[PDB]
Amino acid sequence: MQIFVKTLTGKTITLEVEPSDTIENVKAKIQDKEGIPPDQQRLIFAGKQLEDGRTLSDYNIQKESTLHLVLRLRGG
């Protein structure tokens, strides 16, 4: 099913995921679409940061929902 991801650069992404996807795999699907290393990604939904040990359905995320993405300060 299809969701959205928004980033503070002003860009929006849409992508295809399963409700059983665990969040570090969603970070890896974002790495495949936009190049961003998973260790620099912070993913936010509904007033919290996400933990990668749980799935989109554990967070009650469904089609047409939006994730917010923030970049950490260090790399290279």
Curated annotation (Swiss-Prot):
Specify the effect of residue 65 to D.
Phosphomimetic mutant that binds and activates PRKN
In this UniProt entry, the residues modified to Phosphoserine are: 65
Outcome (variant: residue 72 to A): Impairs ubiquitination by CRL2(KLHDC3) E3 ligase complex. Impairs ubiquitination by CRL2(KLHDC3) E3 ligase complex
- The annotated site for Essential for function falls at 68
Q: Where is this cross-link: Glycyl lysine isopeptide (Gly-Lys) (interchain with K-? in acceptor proteins)?
A: 76
* Known outcome of mutating residue 44 to D: Impairs ubiquitination by CRL2(KLHDC3) E3 ligase complex. Impairs ubiquitination by CRL2(KLHDC3) E3 ligase complex
Q: What is the effect of changing residue 76 to A?
A: Loss of ADP-ribosylation. Impairs ubiquitination by CRL2(KLHDC3) E3 ligase complex. No effect on ubiquitination by CRL2(KLHDC10) E3 ligase complex
- Effect recorded for residue 63 to R: Abolishes HLTF-mediated polyubiquitination of PCNA
Please report the record's description of how this protein sits within the membrane: Peripheral membrane protein
Q: What is the effect of changing residue 74 to K?
A: No effect on ADP-ribosylation
* Residue stretches making up the Ubiquitin-like domain: 1-76
Q: How is it modified after translation?
A: Phosphorylated at Ser-65 by PINK1 during mitophagy. Phosphorylated ubiquitin specifically binds and activates parkin (PRKN), triggering mitophagy. Phosphorylation does not affect E1-mediated E2 charging of ubiquitin but affects discharging of E2 enzymes to form polyubiquitin chains. It also affects deubiquitination by deubiquitinase enzymes such as USP30.
ADP-ribosylglycine modified-residue sites: 76
Localization in the cell: Cytoplasm; Nucleus; Mitochondrion outer membrane
| (Microbial infection) ADP-ribosylthreonine, modified sites | 66
Site residues, Interacts with activating enzyme: 54, 72
Q: Crosslink Glycyl lysine isopeptide (Lys-Gly) (interchain with G-Cter in ubiquitin) sits at which residues?
A: 6, 11, 27, 29, 33, 48, 63
Q: Any idea what job this protein has?
A: Exists either covalently attached to another protein, or free (unanchored). When covalently bound, it is conjugated to target proteins via an isopeptide bond either as a monomer (monoubiquitin), a polymer linked via different Lys residues of the ubiquitin (polyubiquitin chains) or a linear polymer linked via the initiator Met of the ubiquitin (linear polyubiquitin chains).
Protein name in the entry:
Ubiquitin
| Gene source species | Homo sapiens (Human)
The encoding gene is UBC
**Span of the full-length protein shown?**
1 to 76 of 685
